[PDB]
């Protein structure tokens, strides 16, 4: 497998036109397997369309000072309302792989999710982190001995949450058709994808913050009763995400579940937002519509293709300063601004 | 006419492609019978895209135990919620004709529905069955002594259930422009298409419910009102259905139709579902709308004009597949679960 | 120095609104409140009656000759019409005969008894006026798994066919149930159990994941949640989330037999009748309460005959006239 191995900023004017820059150093079928989603790929680009449901409004400016973009969640204080989401298998980007990940968002100061599927050896992760915040993203596991084995990993590697994902990832089932370093570390001798249950249930959230010693989010939640019963199972946040369209196919765009999730957390727990995430103005609109703050995937990891780390920190930067200029013109001066944006409601749809 | 003979399995990743993969191998006016509908097609279109105005919602588990895609109708345990639909002559999409989709359905473990414009001899059909469970599709007879006859025949094969199409097959008028063994059997030296009534009236399901001695379906319903009015008169079941849009154009989608029709048959007999159904997703959303089970039609034969009987046999597998992983994303441990559902309403149609 | 009526009598039931009138001349003060009160200031119990202002009848044609028919069938057993005795505490505050005099007028009608954990009759009392009739047993769920055990039971022996297992306490109980006890309960009773007291789709979703063979869609006749909306409101959402999985049963308001039919129309397979059922027994033992029952089968007959039904599945399918208006019109 020949991933790109060169490292470079790049001119992020952009993050679409990086899905199609990265197909040409990418090898195809690592390519794919990126960019690819369930289906014919309808509910991805339902991901992509959803954020055309609601506009936003320029708006006069209240404040003087110039934008701010920094925000807390957890109580750490992070550069811009975005984190790493967790990704499997960078390597199948670049050959500095997760490392490289974790260099870019560390040196532009967020938070790096950790899969438990990565591809590099923590320590490798590490040396690219450099003392930066990281979350440990995990599977339950049907074998209770190895749940205590990943949340003890998560413990001795700093982490300060865990996010428990609620979906299987046998991969999820699309029309058209590397080791495990940190997983192997435990299942080594036991010869146990399948080694986890295809779908969490309210007494896994439960058993799993029971013990993690560590906040725990839900990653997957698309129905505001699932919100719920996570909170009351013990959820220290909710992550609304539906895995970039990876997994349950002809379901919606994952911002249009956002605002009915948002309005039964009321305020309980903080809540991520993922899937689609592509330009500033989504990051807008994601705050205005009740998340703390938004996760990006695949754009850093088609910049990570594209230059390794320096490659993933312009994207990074990309949407920090489109973020800025979106703030300008909606009269925010602070993230907490842009939460109290009013949207104009689209019927129309895509086509308008 | 040279309809494919080959008999293997097929490895269907989705339904959509059997289609193009048959027009290779079909000849050119079989295929075109097959696959073609009323007017410019809107209405098979609108059969399609129907599907994404309902979307599923991904849910966590409430049970441990793996999915069981198993259900019961008319008192029969079948492997999976769908059944064969009731196509004439399966011979313009392979030799082995309704013999090889009966092999397929019973080795399956489903339902098969025979036409009564079958191209097979019923004995020939029964070869394909080999016990399997069977029901008879019959038109309405302007002539009362053919509609003796056929419920004869019926009962006489071992139909557990008799389909009573409202609708009849002159065709449906299309934009772009073998014999029949079972009726033939009954129709010779009578001189008696045009033998059927074009439309049934609640008299005539009176008169076919009062002398089948076997529960009666009334398929191509799309109103409410109608389905009452055919329960009223003695149907057993409602088998909502355009007939995949072979009949009246610009025509709603069929699942748009099939909750409004739920609601008011009101468990008052089964419902079965068809019109569209292309994918797990499709079968679950039409439970979750009201329907007992669904049956398949076009995919199916494309599956046989690929593959005889295994090339079917691929099909119902892939459905039954992936049902299994819809309800592993729905956090639904059976097909009682899948009729619990709530959708997300997509106001915005297909391009969302 | 408890003094309930104990005459035994047929009544000419015109409407089930004067019962209740007419049952405060003859049941003391106290037990009187006790039967016809509810939470608050009783606008949850008003919710209740005028909620079947909200859907709204049509006559329609017949479409078939025979004369109408009530009987239908529930969980196999076959009953006189589409509707129960809900299970109802202390039906001696009524009667001198309580729940044996409810009991003789349910069986000699030929509809199911619901027996309340909290019945001032002994069972042996109780089975004397069944006589052989069906009866289902409610419960609460115990703090102590024997002591469920214990009622599941001797529920089973004393021939019940169904468990109501109610979700809230009214009053060693729990005050309010989860999930995991319906599984505990559905698991060890060796019966289908109904859980009542739902109001919300979701629950009914939870329950019968959690192994109900029934959902009884209640607010206990306005006795718990106060400032909640009348029962009847709720039902449709909870009969498409049910979905045909398991029976419904309704209740909460019933008063005529319109209701019955708006019940059907909406979902429910049968309703149960609570408070008239007392006032007919309060006013005559089990006549009086037969002759309530009586009412509403016959009222149910003509409300048949006017919308063009011929028998119980008619009426669900019927449609309704939606009311944006509510009460006042
Ligand atoms: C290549 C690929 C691998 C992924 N691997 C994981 C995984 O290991 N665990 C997980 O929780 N999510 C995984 N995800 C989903 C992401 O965490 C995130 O929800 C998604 O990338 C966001 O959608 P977007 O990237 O289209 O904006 C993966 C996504 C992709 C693109
Ligand atoms: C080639 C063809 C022939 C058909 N012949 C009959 C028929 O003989 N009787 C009948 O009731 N329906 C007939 N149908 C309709 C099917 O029973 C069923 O309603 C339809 O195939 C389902 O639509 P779908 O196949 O697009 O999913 C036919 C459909 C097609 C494709
Ligand atoms: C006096 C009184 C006592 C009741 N006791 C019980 C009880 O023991 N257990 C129970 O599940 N419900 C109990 N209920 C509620 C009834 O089962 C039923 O839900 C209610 O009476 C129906 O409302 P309605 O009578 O106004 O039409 C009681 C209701 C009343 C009026």
Same mark, same amino acid.
């Given at each position: 497998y020949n991933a790109p191995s060169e490292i470079k900023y790049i001119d992020v004017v952009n993050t679409y036109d990086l899905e199609e820059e990265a197909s040409k150093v990418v090898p195809h079928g690592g390519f794919n397997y990126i960019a690819g989603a369930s289906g014919d790929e309808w509910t991805k680009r339902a991901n992509d369309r959803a954020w055309k449901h609601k506009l936003l409004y320029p708006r006069l400016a209240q404040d003087v000072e110039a934008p701010d973009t920094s925000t807390e969640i957890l109580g750490h204080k992070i550069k811009a309302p975005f984190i790493m989401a967790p990704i499997a298998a960078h390597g199948l980007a670049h050959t500095?792989?997760?490392?490289?990940?974790?260099?870019?968002?560390?040196?532009?100061?967020?938070?790096?999710?950790?899969?438990?599927?990565?591809?590099?050896?923590?320590?490798?992760?590490?040396?690219?982190?450099?003392?930066?915040?990281?979350?440990?993203?995990?599977?339950?596991?049907?074998?209770?001995?190895?749940?205590?084995?990943?949340?003890?990993?998560?413990?001795?590697?700093? #982490?300060? &949450?865990?996010?428990?994902? $609620? @979906?299987?990832?046998?991969? !999820?089932?699309?029309?058209?058709?590397?080791?495990?370093?940190?997983?192997?570390?435990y299942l080594r001798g036991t010869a146990e994808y399948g080694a986890s249950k295809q779908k969490i249930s309210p007494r896994d959230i439960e058993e799993?913050?029971?013990?993690?010693?560590?906040?725990?989010?839900?990653?997957?939640?698309?129905?505001?009763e699932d919100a719920d019963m996570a909170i009351k199972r013990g959820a220290s946040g909710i992550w609304v995400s539906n895995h970039g369209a990876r997994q349950l196919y002809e379901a919606p765009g994952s911002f249009d579940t956002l605002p009915a999730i948002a309005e039964r957390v009321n305020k309980r727990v903080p809540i991520v937002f993922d899937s689609g995430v592509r330009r500033?103005?989504?990051? #807008?609109? &994601?705050?205005?519509?009740? $998340? @703390?703050?938004?996760?990006? !995937?695949?754009?850093?990891?088609?910049?990570?293709?594209?230059?390794?780390?320096?490659?993933?920190?312009?994207?990074?930067?990309?949407?920090?300063?489109?973020?800025?200029?979106?703030?300008?013109?909606?009269?925010?001066?602070?993230?907490?601004?842009?939460?109290g944006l009013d949207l104009f409601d689209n019927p129309y749809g895509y086509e308008y």
């Open positions: 500095t792989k997760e490392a490289g990940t974790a260099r870019a968002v560390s040196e532009f100061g967020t938070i790096m999710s950790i899969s438990a599927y990565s591809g590099a050896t923590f320590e490798e992760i590490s040396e690219g982190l450099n003392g930066g915040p990281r979350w440990f993203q995990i599977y339950m596991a049907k074998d209770d001995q190895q749940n205590r084995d990943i949340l003890d990993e998560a413990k001795s590697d700093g #982490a300060t &949450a865990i996010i428990l994902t $609620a @979906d299987s990832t046998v991969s !999820g089932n699309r029309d058209r058709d590397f080791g495990m370093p940190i997983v192997q570390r799993i913050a029971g013990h993690s010693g560590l906040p725990v989010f839900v990653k997957g939640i698309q129905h505001p500033g103005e989504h990051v #807008a609109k &994601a705050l205005a519509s009740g $998340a @703390d703050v938004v996760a990006l !995937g695949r754009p850093v990891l088609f910049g990570l293709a594209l230059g390794g780390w320096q490659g993933a920190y312009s994207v990074l930067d990309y949407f920090q300063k489109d973020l800025t200029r979106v703030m300008q013109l909606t009269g925010s001066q602070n993230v907490e601004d842009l939460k």
